[PDB]
Design a protein around this nucleic acid. Structure first.
Ligand SMILES: [Mg+2]
Ligand SMILES: [Mg+2]
Ligand SMILES: [Mg+2]
Ligand SMILES: [Mg+2]
Ligand SMILES: [Mg+2]
Lengths: 217, 182, 25, 53, 144, 96
RNA sequence: ACCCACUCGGCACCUUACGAGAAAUCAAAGUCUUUGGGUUCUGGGGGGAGUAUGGUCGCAAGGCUGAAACUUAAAGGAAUU
RNA sequence: UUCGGGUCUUGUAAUUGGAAUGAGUACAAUGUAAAUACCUUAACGAGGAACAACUGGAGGGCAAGUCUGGUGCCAGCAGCCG
């Protein structure tokens, strides 16, 4: 079973968008889950941690399960889903879905000089969530992922080979750390390099081209 | 009080004990090339790490200029000689990459199993320990010998010892002696 | 325990100590 | 006795007569065989030391 | 700009400020004052021999309950009466009375360990045989 | 329904509660002769509750004499039975 | 004297945050991992203790300065149920 | 159509075989200032009981046990949490 709500979903089903790069170009909302699955079949999805989370009542307590889910490949798209449901497997599934919806690109770059294929980041760039500042820093070839476990896993999922990290603040709250890392990754595609002064065309969106095939009959 | 003899604690631990995946990987590596101790893998990594450090030092200083050009070149030469680095790759950035897997697959440990001789890495190790296998006519009993590419074409069985035609072999000899009396 | 009260008690103790010292002298 | 009862109360069971767990490279080899070659039966998440059931 | 003169001929003020600040860090203070030599029973040493004056079962701290089988030990070098805990399954059956006993720290950079109140040291080498060895019978006591 | 008493072994000795110091430490008088500073064992802080003076079993330590451990509590009936037996001199009284 | 439009200077306040911040909140607590305008001073887990001692300045009460020994895995904040 | 041959490859079992050894001892020889030890090497050296690997762990941190016996807030553990 598939069945699309939203124009974009319909478009994807018709098979007129080839890869998510185009989607990213026009910053399109991807509220429908299946789209990412369709476009990226290469999705390696990892569970991080499932801390029980409590809520107090007149009798007993509510034990929900907050599960941090990463999603990725080696291409430079990463997901991060956080979900809090009562059933643990169900929660994990939901988290996966969320991560798939989220999935974001990375400007993988060069350590120093071009040589062959980018497996680092462009710029020393950081996030901060709650009070956890993950900085990441373009490490040179082969110098590996230099990160705390969670962050390291995230980097692996991304398809970064080489990264220094300065994770600061209370990184022991894993969720927050992960969020910060994700934010930092998102930021990559924001720092205007001089490789970016060059003027673009501004394409008419898939929404404004394949307009007739979109929307319900 | 003549001088101090300069040691080097060379072969160096990782900064955490048990990250499961790391352990698993190292175990796998050991299995692949038959290494008595984690130390061997660690040794290799440390050596590679040294090289990487050197490369990093070179790189930051602008190439076209002296030390980077010269020292870097020398390093490159050395790496090609050990056989670890490939002739495709003479750019220093390539050096910066690499793996433990490149170095382990160039010891006299495996250069036996690649050239046949024993077949099975553990068997090869055993052979090397037991004074079979010379690199030249100079006999080797160092599993992590690192074969220098241009002298790889010379890993043959020893001029002494069985398997390479010298004597029955101290158990075979015994058996022969036993047979003799009958 | 109130901090002010604690301070007061400390002061009293100090005074007592001073008195003792004076006596000794 | 208060001073170390559970050591001087518990029955003595000897170490069994065992074949030698082959040391050096051999043990590493064995471990490799166990973990990445022969492979303990697949269920989802693997177990290094399973309790018999 | 916050505190510190981001100045340039500023440096003496910075250095002095750092010096003044440092004293609030405990370890540095201890190193400098020389708390190691004036106090904390051992002479800032790792191990010290002492003499088993009297065996005392110290009644443990809260949640936990038991008696903790320690020894009031008079150290030789300083002459200080400590209480050194003794590890494992009794082993006072090894310690006895009026014996020479080598003590260690506990792992807590001085201070108190786990749940034993007013206790700082493990015993290791009793009479010169080490408690572990005695207990596991890998080596045995020199008669009396 | 009624409970049954557990007799002493060796070292473990009957005694009387004299005064309440606090914390779980009670100065108990042993009928051997000497007064002792006794500790209320973990099982007894739970349910066992004393008064001004009751009859007890106390494990006397192998290395310390002046400090010991209250193992067991005796009721009025139990005390009377003990008296009848002849383990204790006739002076133990129970009144609240 | 009001009134309307300004305008400096102030005492504040109301919205938004596009920034902060742990949060409560804040036009500053902003322009801080994309960290660097100039400068003082103060803090380094909680107790012990603003104690003891020594200086000092007090007619005294006291103040300014101000320890350590010990001792404990929390003591704290700001929110939520 | 119910198999199967195990044709192609894998491990495991006190089983059972032939091959390697240096650690040992050690003729000489070197080595040495004499001599030890190494480096060469005659002869003698391996059949799980031998020519025998520990140390620490297996609630979590952190790899590894909701195994099998005893103890039962006791013993005792535990760098913290326990
Ligand atoms: Mg302080
Ligand atoms: Mg063991
Ligand atoms: Mg143990
Ligand atoms: Mg065990
Ligand atoms: Mg584990």
């Amino acid at each position: 079973g598939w069945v699309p709500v939203t124009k974009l979903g319909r478009l994807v089903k018709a098979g007129k968008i080839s890869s998510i790069e185009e989607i990213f170009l026009h910053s399109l909302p991807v509220k429908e889950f299946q789209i990412i699955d369709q476009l990226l079949p290469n999705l390696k999805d990892e569970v991080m941690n499932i801390k029980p989370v409590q809520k107090q009542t007149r009798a007993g307590q509510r034990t929900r399960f907050k599960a941090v889910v990463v999603v990725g490949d080696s291409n430079g798209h990463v997901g991060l889903g956080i979900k809090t449901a009562k059933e643990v497997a169900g929660a994990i599934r939901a988290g996966i879905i969320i991560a798939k919806l989220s999935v974001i690109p990375i400007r993988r770059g060069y350590w120093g000089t071009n040589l062959g294929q980018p497996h680092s980041l462009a710029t020393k760039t950081s996030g901060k969530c709650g009070s956890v500042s993950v900085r990441l820093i373009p490490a040179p070839r082969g110098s590996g992922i230099v990160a705390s476990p969670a962050v390291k896993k995230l980097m692996q999922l991304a398809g970064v080979e080489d990264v220094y990290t300065s994770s600061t603040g209370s990184t022991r709250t894993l969720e927050n750390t992960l969020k910060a890392a994700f934010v930092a990754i998102g930021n990559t595609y924001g720092f205007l390099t001089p490789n970016l002064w060059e003027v673009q065309a501004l394409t008419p969106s898939p929404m404004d081209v394949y307009a007739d095939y979109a929307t319900a009959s | 009080p003549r001088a101090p003899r300069t040691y080097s604690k060379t072969y160096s631990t990782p900064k955490r004990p048990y990250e499961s995946a790391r352990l698993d990987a190292e175990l796998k590596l050991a299995g692949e090339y038959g290494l008595k101790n984690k130390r061997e893998i660690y040794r290799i990594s440390f050596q590679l790490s040294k090289i990487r450090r050197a490369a990093r030092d070179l790189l930051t200083r602008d190439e076209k200029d002296p030390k980077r050009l010269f020292e870097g070149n020398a390093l490159i030469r050395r790496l090609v000689r050990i056989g670890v680095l490939s002739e495709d790759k003479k750019k220093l950035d390539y050096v910066l990459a690499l793996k433990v897997e490149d170095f382990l697959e160039r010891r006299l440990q495996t250069q036996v199993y690649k050239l046949g001789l024993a077949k099975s890495v553990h068997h090869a190790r055993v052979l090397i320990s037991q004074r079979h296998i010379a690199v030249g006519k100079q006999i080797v009993n160092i599993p992590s010998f690192m074969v220098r590419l241009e002298s790889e074409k010379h890993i043959d069985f020893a001029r002494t010892s069985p398997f390479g035609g010298a004597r029955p072999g101290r158990v075979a000899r015994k058996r022969a002696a036993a047979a003799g009396g009958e | 325990m109130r901090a002010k009260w604690r301070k007061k008690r400390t002061r009293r103790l100090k005074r007592k100590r001073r008195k003792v010292r004076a006596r000794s002298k | 006795a208060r001073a170390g009862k559970v050591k001087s109360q518990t029955p003595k069971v000897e170490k069994q007569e065992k074949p030698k767990q082959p040391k050096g490279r051999a043990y590493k080899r064995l471990l490799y065989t166990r973990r990445f070659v022969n492979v303990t039966l697949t269920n989802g998440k693997r177990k290094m030391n399973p309790s018999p059931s | 700009g916050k505190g510190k003169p981001r100045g340039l001929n500023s440096a003496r003020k910075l250095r002095v400020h750092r010096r003044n600040n440092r004293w609030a860090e405990t370890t540095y203070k201890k190193r400098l004052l020389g708390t190691a030599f004036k106090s904390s029973p051992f002479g800032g040493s790792s191990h010290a021999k002492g003499i088993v004056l009297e065996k005392i079962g110290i009644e443990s701290k809260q949640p936990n309950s038991a008696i903790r089988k320690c020894v009031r030990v008079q150290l030789i070098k300083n002459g200080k009466k400590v209480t050194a805990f003794v590890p494992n399954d009794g082993c006072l059956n090894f310690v006895d009375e009026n014996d020479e006993v080598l003590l260690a720290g506990f792992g807590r950079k001085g201070k108190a360990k786990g749940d034993i109140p007013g206790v700082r040291f493990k015993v290791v080498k009793v009479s010169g045989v080490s408690l572990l060895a005695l207990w596991k019978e890998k080596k045995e006591k020199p008669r009396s | 329904p009624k409970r049954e008493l557990i007799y002493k072994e060796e070292g473990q000795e009957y005694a009387q509660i004299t005064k309440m110091l606090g914390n779980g430490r009670v100065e108990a008088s042993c009928f051997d002769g000497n007064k002792r500073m006794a500790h209320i064992r973990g099982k007894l802080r739970k349910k066992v509750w004393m008064g001004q003076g009751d009859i007890i079993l106390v494990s006397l330590r192998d290395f310390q004499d002046d400090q010991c451990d209250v193992v067991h509590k005796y009721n009025l009936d139990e005390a009377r039975t003990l008296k009848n037996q002849g383990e204790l001199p006739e002076n133990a009284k129970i009144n609240e």
